[PDB]
Design a protein around this nucleic acid. Structure first.
Ligand SMILES: [Mg+2]
Ligand SMILES: [Mg+2]
Ligand SMILES: [Mg+2]
Ligand SMILES: [Mg+2]
Ligand SMILES: [Mg+2]
Ligand SMILES: [Mg+2]
Ligand SMILES: [Mg+2]
Ligand SMILES: [Mg+2]
Ligand SMILES: [Mg+2]
Ligand SMILES: [Mg+2]
Ligand SMILES: [Mg+2]
Ligand SMILES: [Mg+2]
Ligand SMILES: [Mg+2]
Ligand SMILES: [Mg+2]
Ligand SMILES: [Mg+2]
Ligand SMILES: [Mg+2]
Ligand SMILES: [Mg+2]
Lengths: 38, 222, 118, 97, 83, 19
RNA sequence: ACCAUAGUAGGCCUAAAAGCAGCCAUCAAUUGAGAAAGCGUUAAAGCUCAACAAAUUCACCAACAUAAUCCCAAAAACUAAU
RNA sequence: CGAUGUUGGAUCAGGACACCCAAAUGGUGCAACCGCUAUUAAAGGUUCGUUUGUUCAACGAUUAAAGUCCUACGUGAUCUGAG
RNA sequence: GUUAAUGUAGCUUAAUCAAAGCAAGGCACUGAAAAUGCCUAGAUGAGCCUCAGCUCCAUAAACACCA
């Protein structure tokens, strides 16, 4: 078992990994790119 | 042909005496006799103290958590002291001298037998804290140039920032989190204990919101 | 320590869009719950196991009906990740005593009183 | 597969549950006399009944609950006036004026 | 987990900053008085008075009396001063 | 009790400085 | 890409300090070029930077070697997938 | 632990490359000869003696060179037994 | 001479039992304070009226004024 804090970045429990992968930031995507607009 | 622009002028900058960084001590003047347990919890999560500017307009900002020992202080002091114009710039410690005893045992000891003996002292640094604060009649760019060296040689990941740069990245940080397209945020899920997810999470997570993990802080995490 | 968990009341304040979304009436709450146990109690804390027992949810994918009163909603709140709740609907209204043999419960969550006439 | 589609259409997610496929009496004598009923359908009848009976019961209990509360409210409001009708006529301060 | 006080906390009024410039009761007795006055006020937390039966607490009194005798305030005052 | 609204009602020592 | 001439070796300390060991001022000619941001000299001379004019796609940060019998499924960027 | 026999030699070596030699190159405070570095390359090589049980190590003589290691500190149902 | 207010004891009560509480004083007691004990002075701004009304005086806050 490892301390809560550690040097080496500490592999997460798989479920927590899923949780992290689900909650990622999704940038808003405009319908038309402002550059190809007039 | 190119048209000129008004140059930034500093008439309001007052330079203090002893603009260079003070020498800090290897061991405190009243050395701690009683050996302390190690809170790792003082490196962990966001920082409360020393998050803001005081006198100066530039700083080194700590993006990770870590421990600063005397070697680090020496490095910063020497580097900054010979990389600045003592006339036009001044620097300041935003960090206390190392106060926290850290033990060791002689290499080759068996497990058990007692606690160790006090080897050296350190300072705990939580992510989001200013290490060193530089003011002056300087523009940010020069200071940035040499400060990034120091920043790079610190134990944690760190950056060189100005007031402008800091507020920029904070507004960007909150704007990223009100822009977010996906309905599902770490906060929303953890606080409501969806999927019984609390089972795998730490209590501290409710505050940390998936942005801090151990001593690591990933700014991209909303 | 891993422990029980408070669930701040802000979670249960519904937004105006939600009514449209899940098809509830903004004015009048529904009378009855259809609860189904969707997940398993294994690998979950003993207190959730007990709640699931006392809700009559022991067996999976079997519907069970409960009052919409707060006393029950407390327990459902505890195990809400293990279950599926859908409001019971009565298109033909409540069953009389002539209709007891012919009742049936459709997956859209509605109780049909007259089942298979001639 | 295809449970989702079966659900949108209001059927059972499983072709086995409650459709005409299952419920109907799959055989009969050649003469036309009905066959003894089927054990499965018998049990399904019983517990479907059980379920309905319960729905009725809970509905009724909840109603009777609400009525009882409303009644207690009326009783409170009635006692508040029951104090005033039964009270004595205030005199002392008013008689001098 | 902190909750929020409902209404005023008792000592929240006086300034902790600069204690030396605050007047104290050096008398035990002054304190006793102030305390007994404080114990008569209707606080928002569970109190002795609440459980031990102030006997209906606040009560609007239906009064069947003889009207109080009408006497001049100022005149009476003057006479007594004189006496 | 920490959870309650009435917490720290008996708190005094900040009123008298004896050190 | 292009281009570089003026008081003047500015005043000091030093064997010499000529924009450029150091300390102090940092003014001033010409449309325009710092008492000079880098190289260079014993002190220079000499190369460039910023300045005019000439023009103008975009240009902030980001890259990181390895082990011991023999690599290790095969493969594959679209015919409609909550 | 109802036994996975242990140091150094002998014999036979299998492998890595973090190259000691042989090959091809970059940089030099590379004139030449020497060198000092760095890249690429593992098919083949990598001595004989005096003393130590010795591995190391010192020393004599040489070599194109006398590599660093892994293999139950390779290898005792093949040997040795100095320790 | 004009506007917003007032005149409770030094600060705040009450004005249907009643002008109340606290400061503030003296003497005694121990070195000073402090506590304690025995003591001390006190007010509804002034003139009429009706059984709140009319003025005056004065303060205060401004403005005008005067020097
Ligand atoms: Mg553990
Ligand atoms: Mg670093
Ligand atoms: Mg069966
Ligand atoms: Mg140029
Ligand atoms: Mg390499
Ligand atoms: Mg293969
Ligand atoms: Mg053994
Ligand atoms: Mg055996
Ligand atoms: Mg070999
Ligand atoms: Mg190589
Ligand atoms: Mg060679
Ligand atoms: Mg070889
Ligand atoms: Mg070994
Ligand atoms: Mg061996
Ligand atoms: Mg052997
Ligand atoms: Mg063998
Ligand atoms: Mg009176």
């Amino acid at each position: 078992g490892s301390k809560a804090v550690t040097r080496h970045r500490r592999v997460m429990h798989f479920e927590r990994q899923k949780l992290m992968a689900v909650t990622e930031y999704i940038p808003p995507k405009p319908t038309i790119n402002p550059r190809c607009l007039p | 042909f190119k048209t000129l622009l008004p140059v930034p002028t500093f008439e309001d900058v007052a330079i203090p005496e002893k603009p260079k960084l003070r020498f800090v001590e290897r061991v405190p003047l009243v050395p701690k006799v009683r050996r302390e347990r190690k809170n790792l919890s003082d490196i962990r999560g966001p920082s409360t103290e020393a998050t803001e500017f005081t006198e100066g307009r530039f700083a080194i900002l700590a993006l990770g958590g870590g421990y600063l020992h005397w070697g680090h202080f020496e490095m910063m002091r020497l580097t900054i002291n010979r990389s600045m114009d003592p006339k036009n710039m001044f620097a300041l410690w935003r960090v206390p001298a190392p106060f926290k005893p850290i033990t060791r045992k002689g290499m080759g000891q068996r497990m058990g037998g007692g606690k160790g003996a006090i080897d050296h002292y350190v300072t705990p640094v939580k992510a989001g804290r200013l290490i060193v604060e530089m003011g002056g009649r300087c523009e940010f760019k020069e200071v940035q140039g040499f400060l990034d060296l120091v920043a790079h040689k610190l134990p944690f990941p760190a950056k060189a920032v100005s007031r402008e740069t800091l507020e920029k990245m904070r507004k960007d940080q909150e704007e990223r989190e009100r822009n977010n397209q996906n309905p599902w945020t770490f906060e929303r899920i953890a606080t409501a204990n969806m999927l019984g997810i609390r089972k795998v999470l730490s209590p501290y997570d409710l505050t940390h919101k998936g942005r801090y993990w151990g001593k690591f802080y990933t700014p991209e995490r909303v | 320590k891993f422990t029980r968990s408070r669930i701040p009341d802000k979670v249960f304040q519904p937004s105006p869009e939600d009514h449209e979304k899940y098809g509830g009436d903004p004015q009048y709450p529904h009378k009855l719950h259809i609860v189904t146990r969707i997940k398993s109690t294994k690998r979950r804390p003993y207190w959730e196991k007990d709640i699931i027992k006392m809700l009559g949810l022991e067996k999976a994918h079997t519907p069970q009906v409960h009052k919409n009163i707060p006393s029950v909603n407390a327990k459902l709140k505890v195990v809400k990740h293990l279950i599926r709740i859908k409001p019971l609907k009565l298109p033909q209204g409540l069953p009389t005593e002539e209709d007891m043999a012919n009742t049936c419960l459709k997956s859209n969550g509605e109780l049909v009183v007259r089942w298979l006439l001639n | 597969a295809g449970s989702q589609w079966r659900l949108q259409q209001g059927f059972a997610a499983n072709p086995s549950g409650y459709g005409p496929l299952t419920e109907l009496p799959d055989w009969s004598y050649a003469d036309g006399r009905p066959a003894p009923p089927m054990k499965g359908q018998l049990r399904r009848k019983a517990q479907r009944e059980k379920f309905a009976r319960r729905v009725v019961l809970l509905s009724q209990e909840m109603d009777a609950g609400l009525q009882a509360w409303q009644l207690r409210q009326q009783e409170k409001l009635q006692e508040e006036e029951g104090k005033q009708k039964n009270a004595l006529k205030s005199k002392g301060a008013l008689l001098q004026n | 987990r902190r909750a929020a006080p409902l209404g005023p906390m008792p000592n929240e009024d006086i300034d902790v900053s600069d204690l030396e410039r605050l007047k104290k009761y050096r008398s035990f007795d002054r304190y006793r008085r102030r305390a007994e006055q404080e114990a008569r006020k209707p606080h928002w937390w569970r109190t002795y008075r609440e459980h031990f039966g102030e006997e209906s607490g606040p009560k609007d009194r239906v009064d069947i009396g003889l009207p109080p005798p009408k006497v001049s305030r100022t005149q009476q005052l003057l006479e007594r001063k004189q006496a | 009790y920490r959870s309650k609204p009435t917490h720290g009602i008996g708190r005094y020592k900040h009123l008298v400085k004896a050190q």
